[PDB]
Ligand binder design. Structure first.
Ligand SMILES: [Cl-]
Ligand SMILES: [Zn+2]
Length: 692
């Protein structure tokens, strides 16, 4: 009877129209039995050959991926509580099997044998990348350690996970300990209607039955949706100072302090690095990155240098502006004022009325322009293919991406319109199938890749089309660039195709790339035509759009560089338990990266959850790294001449055949240099943001 389950079928496109929640529990449990059985069959027959290792392994990997991705996609677009319940129940079993599969010593040893064979030197670059990936994944999880040190390793990992939770609880507890009840209406000046509703119902929840946004008893807290409005809008400088000092000192001292827990984490990370043979934990992280410690250190310093003079200007802009507005805070601005005064200056000079911007951005026009841009640049025709694949909502479109010669390269689904009953908000790209030699049906040489695009516009009603914000357009462009790398991959080795096996810090290249075209004049002014007037976007809106992009770039850059730099400092060159302390790192890096010096009491590290509780340890640089790559990749088109459409096609064709084509079967610095002609520069990024 499992025979009838859609998830267990051999399908050509996933059965999105026909899977219900009651199939999930039986089908995922059944699939996991099949795959567990097929893994054991694999392990009994392993040889260091493609047909006896990598091809069997891909088949397991791929089927779990495709099916799990199907049902998990249905949860984001066709959500029911029965479906959530079913997925949250089988998810642990799934992940236990994933763990099992990677821990396979027969498979590890077989890959190791591939690596050590003479045959290695005949293997293709992509196959070598694949093998090295499997080895490196296994090794860095400890599999290569001998049993005593594997136990030490596992004990280190376990204590680290404990410490990371204790870190996170200390921040969360220190965040929620602050409660400030305002009763005087004068003290609550400036705060928006939303914030006042929040703080009033925050007061109601703590007993103040009558509390109202208007009337008062407003309870202010240090959590994000309370903290942000206070720093941006509370005219009350005392309340701004209050909430600032509290926030920058969560977990700074007391029974709730993280300062020793940090040092513990950093010590155990060093023990982990040394068992794996690396000097420091940054070296371990960088073992799977495009960057290196030295190159990341180099880049971040380059950015910090160029960003600094802009950042001091940004402060003088505020002191100037607040003098104009007559505040006694001017000439005396410090931390709790900056967020506020920035917003005030925003509102004055750089502000764009998004209701008189929406009429110009109509969804069907936007998507046409996007697909036409993709034809111009990359040589592909996006063509309606509605009815080839089954669908979960009548509005979901299905497109074939055809190459220059008329053959399909890839297919994608598009789900445009918001359904807040059943559908997650926002926009995303997701993967349906990867491109694969192995997973091709008989007669075909490759299975073609398949992708999801999703967004969340209000559907068209009457005269009015689905209008978009500029930011929504920007996000659809970004997400289409992930989709394009997934779909226009030419790599047939399927564990390494698409975006698979692209080093984290390089993954956001094609996507951050595609956003640049939204600020490109001629592209934007082709899109931006008023749905009723016909008229292009007014030229003063365009100029303001651009002005807004660059606004506090130097201050912004420096803030990100604080985090990126302290993260590498702490994991590179700090000795835990040694001469210098955590706070001397905190202050020493803050001098280099923060124009107004920290107050004492400011302990930003004790709240820096990203690197102590989350997964960005020795990885926070990654944000700015990918930003550098994408800006620079765009400057190839700037150099070629953005108005010479032959030059844009030539440069785009080469992008198509590098960044988008090669997947993870070539190291990213090699792929980037193959496109760009040289190694990456921060100049373009700095120039586009106005810092050089
Ligand atoms: Cl992103
Ligand atoms: Zn992205």
């Amino acid at each position: 009877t499992l025979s009838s389950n859609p998830l267990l079928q051999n399908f050509d496109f996933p059965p999105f129209d026909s899977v219900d929640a009651h199939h999930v529990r039986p089908g995922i449990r059944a699939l996991l039995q099949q795959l567990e059985a097929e893994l054991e069959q694999l392990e009994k027959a392993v040889e260091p050959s493609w047909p006896k290792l990598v091809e069997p392994l891909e088949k397991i990997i791929d089927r779990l991926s495709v099916v799990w991705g199907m049902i998990n996609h249905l949860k984001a677009v066709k959500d029911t509580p029965e479906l959530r319940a079913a997925i949250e129940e089988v998810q642990p079993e799934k992940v236990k099997f994933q763990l099992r599969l990677g821990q396979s010593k027969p498979i590890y040893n077989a890959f190791k044998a591939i690596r050590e064979s003479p045959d290695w030197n005949s293997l293709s670059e992509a196959r070598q990348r694949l093998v090295e990936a499997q080895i490196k994944e296994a090794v860095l999880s400890g599999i290569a350690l001998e049993d005593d040190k594997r136990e030490e390793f596992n004990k280190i990992e376990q204590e680290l996970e404990k410490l990371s939770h204790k870190f996170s609880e200390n921040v969360l507890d220190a965040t929620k300990k602050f409660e400030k009840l305002i009763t005087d209406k004068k003290e609550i000046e400036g705060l928006p209607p939303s914030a006042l509703g929040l703080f009033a119902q925050a007061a109601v929840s703590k007993g103040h039955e009558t509390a109202t946004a208007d009337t008062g008893p407003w309870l202010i807290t240090l959590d994000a949706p309370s903290y942000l409005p206070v720093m941006q809008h509370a005219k009350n400088r005392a309340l701004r100072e209050e909430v600032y000092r509290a926030y920058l000192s969560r977990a700074s001292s007391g029974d709730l302090d993280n300062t020793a827990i940090i040092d513990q984490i950093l010590k155990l990370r060093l023990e982990k690095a040394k068992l794996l043979g690396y000097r420091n934990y940054a070296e371990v992280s960088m073992a799977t990155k495009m960057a290196t410690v030295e190159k990341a250190d180099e880049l971040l310093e380059k950015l910090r240098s160029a960003s600094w003079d802009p950042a001091v200007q940004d402060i003088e802009d505020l002191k100037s502006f607040a003098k104009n507005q007559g505040a006694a805070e001017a000439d005396s601005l410090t931390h709790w004022d900056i967020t506020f005064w920035s917003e005030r200056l925003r509102e004055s000079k750089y502000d764009i009325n998004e209701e008189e911007l929406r009429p110009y951005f109509s969804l069907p026009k936007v998507m046409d322009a996007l697909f036409g841009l993709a034809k111009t640049l990359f040589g592909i025709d996006v063509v309606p293919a509605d009815g080839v694949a089954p669908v979960w909502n009548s509005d979901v479109r299905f497109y074939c991406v055809k190459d220059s010669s008329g053959n399909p390269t890839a297919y994608f689904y598009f789900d445009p319109y918001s359904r807040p009953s059943e559908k997650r908000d926002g926009a995303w790209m997701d993967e349906v199938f990867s491109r694969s030699r192995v997973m091709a049906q008989k007669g075909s040489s490759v299975r073609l890749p398949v992708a999801q695009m999703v967004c969340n516009q209000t559907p068209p009603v009457g005269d009015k089309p689905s209008l978009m914000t500029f930011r929504e357009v920007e996000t659809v462009f970004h997400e289409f660039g992930h989709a394009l790398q997934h779909m226009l991959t030419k790599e047939d080795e399927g564990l390494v195709a698409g975006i698979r096996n692209i080093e984290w810090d390089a993954v956001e290249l094609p996507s951050q790339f595609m956003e640049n075209w939204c600020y490109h004049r001629d592209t934007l002014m082709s899109i931006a035509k008023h749905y009723q007037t016909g008229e292009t976007l007014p030229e003063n809106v365009y100029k303001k759009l651009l002005a807004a992009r660059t606004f506090r770039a130097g201050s912004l850059s420096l803030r990100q560089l604080k985090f990126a730099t302290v993260d590498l400092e702490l994991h590179t060159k700090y000795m835990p338990g040694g001469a210098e302390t955590i706070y001397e790192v905190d202050q020493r890096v803050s001098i280099k990266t923060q124009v107004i010096p920290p107050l004492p009491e400011d302990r930003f590290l004790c709240s820096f959850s990203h690197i102590f509780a989350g997964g960005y340890a020795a990885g926070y640089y990654s944000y700015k790294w990918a930003e550098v790559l994408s800006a620079d990749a765009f400057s190839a088109f700037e150099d070629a001449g953005l108005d010479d459409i032959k030059a844009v096609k030539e440069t785009g064709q080469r992008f198509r055949n590098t960044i988008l084509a090669l997947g993870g079967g070539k190291a990213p610095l090699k792929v980037f240099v193959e496109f760009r002609g040289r190694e990456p520069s921060p100049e373009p990024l700095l120039r586009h943001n106005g810092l050089l």
